[PDB]
Structure formats: C-alpha cells, structure tokens
Amino acid sequence: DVNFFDELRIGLATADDIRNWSYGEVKKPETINYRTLKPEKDGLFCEKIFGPTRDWECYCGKYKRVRFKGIICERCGVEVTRAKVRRERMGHIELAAPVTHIWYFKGVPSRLGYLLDLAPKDLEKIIYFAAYVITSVDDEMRHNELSTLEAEMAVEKKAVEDQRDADLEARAQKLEADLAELEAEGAKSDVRRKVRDSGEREMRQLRDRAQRELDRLDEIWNTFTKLAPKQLIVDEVLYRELQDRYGEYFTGAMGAESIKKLIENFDIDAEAESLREVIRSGKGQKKLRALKRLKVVAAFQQSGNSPMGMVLDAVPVIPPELRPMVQLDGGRFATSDLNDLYRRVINRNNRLKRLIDLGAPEIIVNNEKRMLQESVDALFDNGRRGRPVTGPGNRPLKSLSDLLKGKQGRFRQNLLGKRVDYSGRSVIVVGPQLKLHQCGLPKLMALELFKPFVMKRLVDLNHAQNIKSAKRMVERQRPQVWDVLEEVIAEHPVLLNRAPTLHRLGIQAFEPQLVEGKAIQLHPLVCEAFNADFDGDQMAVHLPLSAEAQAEARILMLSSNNILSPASGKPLAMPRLDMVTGLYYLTTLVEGATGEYQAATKDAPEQGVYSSPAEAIMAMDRGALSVRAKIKVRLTELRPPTDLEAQLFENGWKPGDAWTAETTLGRVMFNELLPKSYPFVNEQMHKKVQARIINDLAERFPMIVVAQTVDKLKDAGFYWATRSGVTVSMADVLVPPQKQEILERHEAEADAIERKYQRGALNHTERNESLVKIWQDATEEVGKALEEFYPADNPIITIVKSGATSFREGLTVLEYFINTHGARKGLADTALRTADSGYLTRRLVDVSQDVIVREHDCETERGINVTLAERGRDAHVETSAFARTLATDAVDANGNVIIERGHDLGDPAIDALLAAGITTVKVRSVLTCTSATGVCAMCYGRSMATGKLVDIGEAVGIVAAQSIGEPGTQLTGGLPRVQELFEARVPRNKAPIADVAGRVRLEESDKFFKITIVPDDGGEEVVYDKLSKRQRLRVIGVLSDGDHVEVGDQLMEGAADPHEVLRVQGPREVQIHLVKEVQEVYRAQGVSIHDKHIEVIVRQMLRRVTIIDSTERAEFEAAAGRPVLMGITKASLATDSWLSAASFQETTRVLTDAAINCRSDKLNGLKENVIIGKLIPAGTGISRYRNIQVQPTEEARAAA
Ligand SMILES: [Zn+2]
C-alpha cells in the first residue's frame, strides 16, 4: 500500500497460479443454511476458506476476542482475523476434466485456432465434443505394417466385389426367368415394361449399396494412410471402424483435454521457424494467413507464458463480498448471479466425478464434460456462445465479463466515475449582486458541507466541550453555530459544476457566501460558461479539502482567473442579454435630446457645455440634461482618444489634466467603468464593441483589472437595462397590416402567371425565374413594410441592434397541423446532435489525453505557412494566425524586418505585419514539434485562456478534445463529416487529386467524366477515367480544359481520400488538409476553434509507421517503414498502456491480446494514474512541480 508502483503487468494464469491464489477448494454448491443463514462449510461463502464473518471470531466461537490473531480454530477451521479478508481471499475449483478458456476460443480471431491451425468452426467441434481429433500417430509401426494392411484391405475389398457381382447376376438371371414366364402367360406390353423397370432399378439399388460400402472402405484406408495429428474425424462411425482396426497405430480424443494434448507436444520454436517462411509466394493471403497467425505464435515465444494456460485445470472463485448474498430490507434475500454461475459449474463438475467413478458410458461422461465446458464459458463470458444462461424472468445472468465492462459497469465509468463525499447540489438562481469570484451558498448546504470544520471550531471555542457535543450542536442547528460558520467558510473556496461538463470552464471555484434560502446564487456572467439556464437548472458543489486542492481552486480554477474561452481566446464573461441592451441604451446618442448641446448664438454662449461630469449629473437629476444627449464637457480623471490627445498634449497623457470633448453623459459614465488608464471610446456600445473592447483591454491589463471591469459593466448594464424602457406589448408585436394585404397581392401574380403558363406563355424557365422575382419582390417588400413600420427605438428592434440576442394573426386548425410536422423533426434531430457529440468527444479525449507540454522549446526550425490576409485581411486569420509563434523572421521587401522570430504574434503584431503588407508567415506548430515527449511551449504558442505563453504543465490534448467536442451540439456537412475526418475513413463520395503537375484534358462522355493530366516532364500521362458527373468539378472559375494543375490540387468537388493525399503530398500536407476540412465544417456553423486544437488531434494520427520488413517514430532512430494515417479510435487502441486501452473499447480483445503478449504498463499516461489513484502526469502532477522545496529565506526568519 505504498501508492507508487512503477509497472502493471498481466499474463495467462496457470492452474498452479490459480491454486496458489486460492485459500482452499470450494467443494459444494451451497451458500448459506436456510435456517441458521450462516455460510455452509466447504461451499461458497465458507468462512474456513474466504474468511470469517465477524472480526476476530471463528465459526464455532471458541475464539472470540482480538487477543489471538493469525491463528486458526482447530474445530471450525476458521482463521481469527479481520472480516475484511472476506473481500480479498479467493477460492478455486479443481476440474475433473480440463476446460478451454472461452476468451481464447471464441474470441475473434481465435487465439487458439491461430495457434494450432484449427479453423474456429473446426476447433468449436473439438472442445464441444462434436468430432474426434488425432492426437498421436505411430509412423514406424504404420509404415512397417503398411504392406500387410494393404493386402488385407484389398482382399476384404475384393470379397465385397465378388459378393456384388454374384448378387447382380442372381437378380438378372432371376429377372430373365420372371420375364420368360410372361411369354408363356398373358403378355401385357405395359406390364412387360413395368416389370423390367422394377427389376432394372432394383439392380441399380443392389449395385449402389455395394458401391457405398466400397467407398466407405476406400474412405477408411485413405484416411488411415494419410492419418496425421490435428486431423478431425467427424464421422464417428468411421472413427470407430478406424479404431477397431489400426487402433494401436494412433490415438484420438475429444474435448478440452485433447486440445490440451495438442498443446503439450507443440514445439513453439519449430512451429515458428516453419512460419518464418517470408518466401513461399506470400503475395497471396496464404502467407498473410500465416502472417496473422505468426503474431500469436511469436508472442508465446518472445514471452515466457506456457500456451497451456488457455486450458484450465482449476478455476478461481471470486471473494464472497464481491458476489455478496445479503438479506434485503423487508425480509427478502438478494445475491449476485456469480453464485448461480459458480453453482452450475461446481454441480456439473461434481456430477462428473460421480460418473467417472461409476464407470458410466462415454456418451454420458462426454455429455458431462460438454456441460461442464459450457458452465465455465457462461461463468466467464455468458452469452458469448449460444443462448446465455437466464434466470427467472428470462434475463441473462451477469458473468465476470459483463461485471468487468459496461457503460455503467466497473470498466468504463463505474471505475472512472464514482460518487464523492463533501458534496451537494440544488437549483440555481441569478445572483446579480455577487462579485465574479463569489457564489451564493444556502446556509443549510454550507453547514452540512463544512460540518467537520464547524465542529472543531465550536469545540476550540468553549461552546461545546467535546466532539460529540459539537455534532448534535450542528445537527439540531442551534443558532450559535452560524457565527462560527462564516469563519470556517471565509477564504475557503468551493467548486461549482453543472452537467453536462463540456469544457473545463464547466467547473470553477468561488468564494462561498452564506445566503438565505435553499437555492444556489450563481453569478450572471458565468452562465455562458456553464450554459446554465435559470429554468430549474441544478448545479453541484464540491468542497476542496487538502491544501493542494484549495491551492488548485484559488489559482487554477478560480472564476475571475478564467475569463477567456480556452478554445477561441474570446471572452466568455463578457456582458450579454440585459447587460448589453442596458449599456447600448446608456451610450446611445439621441439627436435632439433634452439637454442637447447648442453652439454659441449671436447673443448667448454654448449652452451644452458643463464644468465637470458631476455637474451633468446634477443637471440630469433635474429635467435639464438627458443621459443620451450630445453635450460637451471637460474631463480631468479620464483618458482622451489616442489620436485626438496627441494634438492636445504630446507632453503626456492627462493624469489630472483637463480636456473637453463632446459625448453623451452615458458614454462618460460608461468610460468611468473602464480602467483609468484606458483611453476614451465615445461610441454606442454593441456586443462586438464591448467584445472588441474587452479583448483589447484583456491583452493590455492583468485579468484582475479585466475581472473588475466586467463586473462594473454588469452593474451598469443591469441598472440601465431597467431604465431602458424595454417591454413587450401588442403594439410592439402585432402585425403590419400592409403585409397581409400585399401578400394577397403578390399571391395573385403567382396564380395568374400559372394561368399564363398553362396556355403557352410558359417559355420554359421564364416561369421559374418570374415566380422567384415575385416571391422575392414580395419577400423584400415585406421587410421594408415591416422594418420601416417599426420605430427605430422599438423594444424589439433595440434588443436586435444591441446584439443581446409570425403567429400574430393566429393560425386556423389546418394551418397549425402542418406546422407540427416540421417542429417535431427539430426536437428529434436535436436528440441525435447531443449523443454523437458526446461519443465523438470521448474518442477525441481517448486519443489526445496524454498530450502535454514537456519542455519550453524543442528548437526545431520546422513550421507551417499561413495565408494571412489576401485583400491586397483574411477572414480566418483569427483561428490560424492569432496566438502563434514565428519560426522565421518577418522580412519586408524593402529590407525592414518587422516582428522577430519566436514572437507571440498578438493582434497588434498582425496589424504591424499588415502595415508592411506581408501576405504569408511561417509559424511554429505542434504538427512540426520535434519534442520526444508531448509538445513544447513555443511550438504550441499562447494559451487561449491565459493570453500568455502556455505553461509547461498544460495538458493541451484534453483541452483540444473539449474545444472540439463542445460545439458539436451546433452541427447540422456536419457531425458525420467530422467523424469521417477524425476517423480517417475513405470519404463518403471520393474525389481525386492530381498525382503530378501539368496540363489537364477534360473529356466529356455520357457514361463518365474523364480527366487526363499531361505532365510537364513530360512523362506518362495520368488518367482519371472513372468519374461521376453528379460530383461536378472543382472551382478555381471552374477547372476547364487546358488549365494548369499542381501536385496537390483537387480535381473534382467532394472529399479527397486522406490516405491518397498522404502518399502523394506526404505526412505534413495531410495534417494541413485534415485541419483544413475539419475547420471548414465548424466554420460553416460559425464556430471559432483555433487551429492548434485540431492540430493537436491530427498530430496523433501520423505518429506511427507501417513495418514492411524488420509503430512509433522514436524506435527507428535506435527495416523500412512508411508514414501511416489512421483514425483516432485505431490510434487510441494502439497506446502503450493496456489498461488504458482496455477501458476505451472492447476490453476482451485488449485483455486477451495483452495477457498473451504479457505486456507491462509503465503507468505513463494519466488515465492509468486516475484508475489506480495516482497523481496524473500533468499540471501539478509533473515531477518538476510536485518536488518543489519551500524554505523561508534566512532574511525573513530574522524579521520573525
Ligand atoms: Zn471455531
């Protein structure tokens, strides 16, 4: 129980291993006495083997006190020790007949079948007693006696011929007499042919019966001469006759013991060398059939596992506590299915001993071994072969396989996902008055959550005298604890989470504030992250305990420290909904306002000017100044625009200096919210403006400044959202009466046009275009009739303009029916959007979880170019160029270098680059990182969450998977296309790529399109004859006849085979393609994902190569292999960790292949450490971080 083990290894458990594990053989299929209800002896639950029921108490009771431990009672045979051993100790069952392990027999491909060259359909007939197998053969005796055996065989065969020919002549000669009697008697011409037909056919019968015996004889002899071990004799009768004679020359048997023998005399090395034949043709599958099988044969040779392990002589019995039998509440009993499966095994096994001792016939005995064989199969993997064993109600019993795996089973999530103490949940309610780092916690919830803490505090304080006195003091909720509760809660962070958890921001830390009520008060800014509606949504609370946990919450998972989306870098805590309209109304400029500014007239000065913002406030309180007026005022503690100030100053930005600009009091009150160092804005604030502003100020200020600035915007937005006058009513919605009238107007144009179409004015496409012109003219006419009819400041329009976000006439009966037909498809289609996105996100995580930053820099010059603008700004520079690092300097044509290599490439850098007009830039990428382990900080680049360089410990693979899986809910060219890419499957509709460079010859044929490429070598022409016209052409105009094509261009519309572009353009260009297509899907849905996230996933596909002649890349540096592209699922299953891969998909094959290979897991990944409870090798788990030493400086200790 050290908690730090290096490796974890498997292997075939031999009969001895099982016997060594067990604490005694369970001999009876009994559980507990129906009266005493105590465990029966020698049976399941037997305390004499598994363990005592009570601590330090034997079965009889002659030893009861803890005084004696480690001894065994000489009466009941029970060891006096803790009752827990009942959960650690196993038993075993000695089988009267060997049995095959179903995992190596029925497990496809048959591990045993591949190990002995027995087809699974043939092997199934052997171990289940459906055919005999030749175990041994005496070659010398069969050869020395072949002469006499052949003679005796020919003689016996001849005696059959002499009988046959003698019989036919007796039938034909007798038929001649019967027919001769017909001439003397009345001759019926019909009967004459009827008798002959009867006689002739009878001869054929007599002659064919003889032939069949001859063939049976020939069959007997041929099989005996060619008789070789591993041959199967399914004929039984043949086998018996093959045993009556020649029985002393060979041997044969059925069942697992026969398979046990074939494995006995089996030279593993000899069978391998004959399989080492890389010659003997091999281009055909015949060698692959040996190639595929050689893996299973070599695995046993390279390891020490004896292949005998595939046949069990003893079966281990799982401890009772894992298969418990307890009496349910209400008097009823409950017990696991394993007990009924073990019972079937131990019953049939015992009956076999009985039959063996009774000298029963082999039909009965063999029938028992077959029954025993099936009982062990059911015990291990019930249902894997034949119908599963079902109990009352016809439900399949849960075997050990099912118990191991399952979605809710102990393999996938029952082991990974477990319930935790110090937790709780409740419905959430808005907490508009909360600080971003705070959360409303119901007093009762915070009480029970911190119960141990408050118990100690109110005991330290002489309120309660002992612990027990403190417990009741909290349970009864005596009013004296509350004051103690706010202390224990102070500066003690708690974790909030809302299911489902999509990204890491779905869990954040908060300062707990005791709040009246039973609900949880959530800050209104984190809703975006949690995606938390306030329509009854619930959230969970977890209480970090250890000092490390609290440190991780305060530092890593603090709410205020996580503002930017770790997927796009954009801000999530940005104001939204009311806060937007509130600020939109606050800063909007209304012409002709109440206190509007007026230029000095002939006899009066300017009346819109005000001394300070305070004066404007006083003027606002009176009916003088409107918040949205165009007044001009002087400012002393605010910052003027960068461009305007330079004129007014240059000596320095105003710290207390005065300056006058014309704005609105709102815009003044707004800028007061921003930092004092931030220049003035003077604009009506939209989501984007506030989004544009929050970003800009997030780069130039620490997040604490951004955290407080977003909080201040929340208050203002909410405050002015109320004074905004935004309310809905009939006059706000209603209907533009011109619409219904004008709609009936244009409808007449479409009906009479059809009238004109029928007569002869159709003119083909004239109708389709005309009807479209009318429909779009009316559709465009209603927009104006509605947009111009709605006031500019209409509440519906205001909400739309700010960016926070027709049944008005009513529908008749039939109209509403049609609407339901489509509305129900959206709800059902939405059900499939969430399932697959979570199934994709799991595979994504399954393949990239072990990817973490391991070093600051790998120092590789390799990089990837970026298109970066094309106007002569690109539309997607924010996803691929932003937050990158330059592998090479940015050189201008004029010789001036701007932005040096290894720079952060901030948006100001993008503009500085755009200033010099540089189209492309080479950039570091995880696709090119040469890090031996994971990736490096520089290659990865800026962390989207922190805005700075990525920290060394960051586990970017998981963040990438979440960044990709989360938006999967918004996929419609959607989720299937994405899985098509990440899984590396050939495209749904394949598309060709240019295999070389040169011109193109477009040929038009009704059957198919033909694209020939004339190389510029010029060498052999490349023909792409097979082409479906339904696939269209690729766009540049369209690819026409005679155009030039490059080495990687796509010829027709569709998806190019990634495996195709791999061998053509190489690995690096494949990864650029996959990221290109993947990002294009999400971009189609308006989803902003930084390329690096996709790149992290793509990096893991090209990490291995195929070995054509004697896998990862690092092994080759210390025998030719080609770069390989493979899907995430296949790649994940190829991980070095076997229990990690076992938890992923199909645990049986991984477990069987792992046990045979005898693999050892070094616990390198983080999934493994999660299962066993070790510190994951990421974040605070890295060695460099967890081995830090904290010693106070000698100078500080002096101060004391
Ligand atoms: Zn005893």
Ligand SMILES: [Zn+2]
């Ligand atoms: Zn690197």
